[PDB]
RNA sequence: AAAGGUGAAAAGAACCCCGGGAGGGGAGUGAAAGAGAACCUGAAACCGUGGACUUACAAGCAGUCAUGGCACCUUAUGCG
RNA sequence: GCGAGAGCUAACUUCCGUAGCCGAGAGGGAAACAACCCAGACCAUCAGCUAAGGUCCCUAAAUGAUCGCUCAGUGGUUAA
RNA sequence: GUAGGGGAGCGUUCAGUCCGCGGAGAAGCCAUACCGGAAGGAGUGGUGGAGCCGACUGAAGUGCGGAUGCCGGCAUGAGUAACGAUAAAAGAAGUGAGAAUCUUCUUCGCCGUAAGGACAAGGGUUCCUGGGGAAGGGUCGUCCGCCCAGGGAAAGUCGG
């Protein structure tokens, strides 16, 4: 079989540097269009990140800072966005799919906060 | 009648709802795929299906289809909302033979084909 | 050499019995509820940018 | 003086090429093959006349006794009978008489038994 | 090495349509574009569109002879 | 095939004699099958009599007639 | 009826001669159920756009499926295998007829006795600026080492 549960298409570090790279852009710009699948990878990861930020203690900040290497973006998620999602049962990030693309026929999409 | 020679002059010979992109740098066989979903329908649909169909042959077929339309309409004073792809097809124009290197000295020729995409629009109607 | 290699040219026919399966399926376009242009089910209307409200920029 | 083959060969070819009709694929579009098909074609053509003669008398003999036996005779017998009566001497059209005119055919049938035993 | 050919004469296509272009459709010139500049004729292989008769229990050098069905009938309705 | 040698009176073996056919020979027959058997194709014919071989059905023609033989499927893979 | 010998003829070009034919239309091409014992011939229609049948005689680079033949064109394999080091890439923003593939920003990753820098030889303008967008670039390209135009190179002591 192969009844596992995750995705790659890169080695072990690339797949981690991406999910971190998108995690950050998503949080730094509230929205980003990306390959449909990549957004799918991103979504859960990021939601987790918003939930770690959603604690306010230094510990929770320091943890987020492990997957958000930009001081400015951490402050945002830490002080602006995490506090805002206070009352929603971690469930906000939505993906919209757009049209297929020209250079490679790949269907792009939107993942927005 | 008269005889051939007089005919040629009494007449000019025209092509209703007809356009044709000659020498499109694609493979006939490749373009045909797209030209095939569009054959025989509401020139509207053709406009529509092309916008979405993923093959990169779609643009050219698009362009020819809206040129054959801009004719049926103009040079033919046709009623666009009865227009429908009467006929469409793809023929091969010249072929751009190009040489490519291969392993151990030998060489090869890549055939970069080309196509003449022509499409003919015509008013439909039942009766 | 080029080890396996074909025994005979294939009929124009045979060669076609083959391809009897390469016909594209035309998209199943829907008509956008607002600007009414046709769209792709579950995606945003490239002509108005809606998906109930207006998501993509004009 | 030089002396091309021009037009002289195209024609020789179209001649054969056009003989091949419902000749399947290549056999009806390529000279060489189409032509070649027509050699075997010779073989059949010629030998099939000296032969449909063989085939037809067979169709005749088959019917002539599916009527012969329709009364109680059978080709073998039946035939020698009409024979026994130099009088009778069709054999050719006999089948047909046996296929279309039952009224008649019977006649000849019984006619033989009446020249037989 | 290969490589020729608009038209009598450039009169070689003003202006309008679709296209970024290429290309094409009209208009106009010309006897002719059923000569337009990837321009005398333009065979064949080879690709394709439409139509007619066919084909999804079948073992096939691919035809040939015979018969029936369907279609069509300018040297051709009576033979094809 | 017939007559010999050679060879294990082996070989679609080899070498000579001699007849026939294939080679340069179609047609019928022997399932298929150069040479075995009957026969030598000037062309046409939905005509007729025969050869060798055959006459339950697959294919044309007596599942014919009379007196017997074997029960083995002998028929339709050999001997002391 | 194979090797072979003998006989009678068909066709192709060129040449002499005869009868001619043609822009209301030649040759060539294309279609055809006619003609002749064959090679072959004719009629009709379509195409074509200028030279051309028939007859007698003469001369021939005179007749093709084969030669792993020669040149050219086009097929099959088949939309198959490949797209040339496993040093990754992401987002935003911009330009544009059109961009994964160009430009900008911000990150990521790879080399760092090098995948940095300076010459030599060799190559020549490939350099810079503005344009370009056929073909080349194993894919896009609005970009390029590609195309077009203009500009650029400065030595008494560095090499000769
Ligand atoms: Mg013994
Ligand atoms: Mg050859």
Curated annotation (Swiss-Prot), chain A:
PANTHER family (UniProt xref): LARGE RIBOSOMAL SUBUNIT PROTEIN BL17M (PTHR14413:SF16), RIBOSOMAL PROTEIN L17 (PTHR14413)
GO annotation, cellular component aspect: cytosolic large ribosomal subunit
Transmembrane segments: none
Keyword Metal-binding: no
InterPro entries: Ribosomal_bL17 (IPR000456), Ribosomal_bL17_CS (IPR047859), Ribosomal_bL17_sf (IPR036373)
Name of the protein in its database record: Large ribosomal subunit protein bL17
Coiled-coil boundaries: none
SUPFAM superfamilies, per the entry: Prokaryotic ribosomal protein L17 (SSF64263)
UniProt family annotation: Belongs to the bacterial ribosomal protein bL17 family.
Keywords associated with the record: Ribonucleoprotein, Ribosomal protein, RNA-binding, rRNA-binding
Biological processes annotated in GO: translation
Subunit structure of this chain's protein: Part of the 50S ribosomal subunit. Contacts proteins L3 and L32.
Keyword Flavoprotein: no
Function (record text): Binds to the 23S rRNA.
MF (Gene Ontology): rRNA binding; structural constituent of ribosome
Curated annotation (Swiss-Prot), chain B:
Domain of life of the organism encoding this protein: Bacteria
Entry GO MF terms: rRNA binding; structural constituent of ribosome
Biological processes per GO annotation: translation
One GO CC term, this protein: cytosolic large ribosomal subunit
Gene3D superfamilies: Ribosomal protein L22/L17
NCBIfam families, A to Z: rplV_bact (TIGR01044)
Family note: Belongs to the universal ribosomal protein uL22 family.
Subunit structure: Part of the 50S ribosomal subunit. Contacts protein L32.
The protein's name: Large ribosomal subunit protein uL22
Source organism (scientific name): Deinococcus radiodurans (strain ATCC 13939 / DSM 20539 / JCM 16871 / CCUG 27074 / LMG 4051 / NBRC 15346 / NCIMB 9279 / VKM B-1422 / R1)
Curated annotation (Swiss-Prot), chain C:
Coiled-coil region(s): none
Residue ranges, annotated region (Disordered): 1-33
Zinc finger intervals, C4-type: 32-48
Compositionally biased region (Basic residues): 1-22
Keywords associated with the record: Metal-binding, Ribonucleoprotein, Ribosomal protein, RNA-binding, rRNA-binding, Zinc, Zinc-finger
SUPFAM superfamilies the record matches: Zn-binding ribosomal proteins
An annotated GO cellular component: large ribosomal subunit
Pfam family, one: Ribosomal_L32p
Residues binding Zn(2+), per UniProt: 32, 35, 45, 48
Cofactor(s) listed in the protein's UniProt record: Zn(2+)
MF GO annotations: rRNA binding; structural constituent of ribosome; zinc ion binding
Textual note on the cofactor: Binds 1 zinc ion per subunit.
Domain of life: Bacteria
GO BP annotation list: translation
Family: Belongs to the bacterial ribosomal protein bL32 family.
Function summary: Forms a cluster with L17 and L22, and with L22, a pair of 'tweezers' that hold together all the domains of the 23S rRNA. Interacts with the antibiotic troleandomycin which blocks the peptide exit tunnel.
Record text on subunit structure and interactions: Part of the 50S ribosomal subunit. Contacts proteins L17 and L22.
Record-given protein name: Large ribosomal subunit protein bL32
Organism of provenance: Deinococcus radiodurans (strain ATCC 13939 / DSM 20539 / JCM 16871 / CCUG 27074 / LMG 4051 / NBRC 15346 / NCIMB 9279 / VKM B-1422 / R1)
Gene designation per UniProt: rpmF
Swiss-Prot record, chain D:
PROSITE patterns: RIBOSOMAL_L20
A single cellular component GO annotation: cytosolic large ribosomal subunit
Record bears the keyword Ribosomal protein: yes
Keywords: Ribonucleoprotein, Ribosomal protein, RNA-binding, rRNA-binding
Matching Gene3D superfamilies: 6.10.160.10, Ribosomal protein L20 (1.10.1900.20)
CDD domains reported in the protein's UniProt record: Ribosomal_L20
Entry-linked InterPro entries: Ribosomal_bL20 (IPR005813), RIBOSOMAL_L20_CS (IPR049946), Ribosomal_protein_bL20_C (IPR035566)
Gene Ontology BP terms: ribosomal large subunit assembly; translation
Domain of life: Bacteria
Gene Ontology molecular function terms on file: rRNA binding; structural constituent of ribosome
Function description: Binds directly to 23S rRNA, probably serving to organize its structure.
HAMAP family, per database record: Ribosomal_bL20
Family membership noted in the UniProt record: Belongs to the bacterial ribosomal protein bL20 family.
Subunit structure, as described in the record: Part of the 50S ribosomal subunit. Contacts proteins L13 and L21.
Name under which the protein is recorded: Large ribosomal subunit protein bL20
Originating organism: Deinococcus radiodurans (strain ATCC 13939 / DSM 20539 / JCM 16871 / CCUG 27074 / LMG 4051 / NBRC 15346 / NCIMB 9279 / VKM B-1422 / R1)
């Amino acid at each position: 079989h192969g009844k596992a549960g995750r995705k790659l298409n890169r080695n072990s570090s690339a797949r981690v540097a991406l999910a971190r790279a998108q995690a950050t852009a998503l949080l730094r710009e509230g929205r980003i269009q990306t390959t449909l699948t990549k957004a799918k990878e991103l979504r859960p990861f990021v939601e987790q990140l918003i939930t770690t930020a959603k604690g306010g203690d230094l510990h929770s900040r320091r943890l987020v800072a492990q997957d958000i290497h930009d001081k400015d973006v951490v402050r945002k998620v830490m002080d602006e966005v995490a506090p805002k999602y206070a009352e929603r049962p971690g469930g906000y990030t939505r993906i919209l799919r757009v049209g297929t693309r020209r250079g490679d026929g790949v269907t792009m999409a939107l993942i927005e906060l | 009648f008269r005889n051939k020679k007089q005919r040629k002059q009494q007449v000019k010979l025209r092509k209703p709802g007809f356009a044709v992109a000659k020498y499109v740098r694609m493979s006939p066989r490749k373009v045909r795929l797209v030209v095939d979903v569009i054959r025989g329908k509401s020139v509207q649909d053709a406009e529509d299906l092309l916008r979405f169909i993923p093959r990169s042959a779609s643009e050219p077929v698009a362009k020819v289809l809206n040129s054959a339309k801009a004719n049926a309409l103009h040079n033919d004073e046709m009623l666009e909302d009865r227009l429908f792809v009467k006929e469409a097809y793809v023929d091969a124009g010249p072929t751009l033979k190009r040489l490519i290197p291969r392993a151990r000295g030998s060489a090869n020729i890549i055939k970069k084909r080309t196509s003449h995409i022509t499409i003919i629009v015509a008013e439909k109607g039942n009766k | 050499a080029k080890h396996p290699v074909p025994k005979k040219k294939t009929s124009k026919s045979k060669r076609d019995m083959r391809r009897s399966h390469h016909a594209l399926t035309a998209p199943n376009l829907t008509e956008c509820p607002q600007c009414h242009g046709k769209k792709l089910s579950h995606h945003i209307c490239p002509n108005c940018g809606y998906y109930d409200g207006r998501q993509v920029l004009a | 003086p030089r002396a091309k083959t021009g037009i002289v060969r195209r024609r020789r070819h179209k001649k054969v090429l056009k003989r091949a009709k419902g000749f399947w694929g290549s056999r009806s579009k390529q000279y060489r093959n189409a032509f070649q098909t027509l050699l075997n074609a010779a073989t059949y053509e010629y030998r099939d006349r000296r032969n449909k003669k063989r085939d037809f008398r067979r169709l005749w003999i088959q019917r002539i006794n599916a009527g012969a036996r329709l009364h109680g005779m059978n080709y073998s017998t039946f035939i020698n009978g009409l024979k026994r009566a130099n009088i009778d001497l069709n054999r050719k059209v006999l089948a047909d008489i046996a296929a279309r005119e039952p009224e008649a055919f019977k006649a000849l049938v019984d006619a033989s038994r009446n020249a037989r035993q």
